[PDB]
């Protein structure tokens, strides 16, 4: 076909390796922000539910 | 923390009872039912209001 052909396949198959190690790259650190501070969808560990609160008035007032 | 605010022995003083319970339990139907407006003010007060400090009078 000609070299015109393998260069710019070669420049397509560069510019995905370097989008996927940039992307490799934020996701390591977004991974590290989110387990030291969890704010994101990920490292959400659980907690006690709400809807078993029992919010009925009790026997004793002082509750 | 805080200072915990409660109230006096002055405000805490009341004429009080001085009833057995059995004479209370013989009367406690018609206790009930003659003032039960008055009962169910302090019920309703002190179930709203968890403290007790703001019920008194």
Same mark, same amino acid.
């Given at each position: ?45 659980? @907690?006690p ?15 | ?36 407006? @008055? ?11 968890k ?6 009078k």
């Open positions: 076909d000609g070299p015109e052909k393998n260069y710019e396949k070669t420049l397509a198959i560069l510019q995905i390796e370097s989008e996927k190690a940039e992307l490799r790259l934020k996701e390591q650190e977004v991974r590290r922000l989110m387990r030291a501070r969890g704010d994101g969808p990920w490292y959400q560990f659980p @907690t539910e709400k809807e078993f609160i029992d919010h009925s008035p009790k026997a004793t007032p002082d509750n | 923390p805080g200072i915990v605010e409660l109230p006096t022995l002055e405000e805490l003083k009341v004429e009080e009872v001085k009833v057995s319970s059995a004479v209370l339990k013989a009367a406690a139907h018609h206790y009930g039912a003659q003032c039960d407006k @008055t009962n169910k003010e302090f019920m309703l007060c002190r179930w709203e209001e403290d007790p400090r703001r019920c008194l």
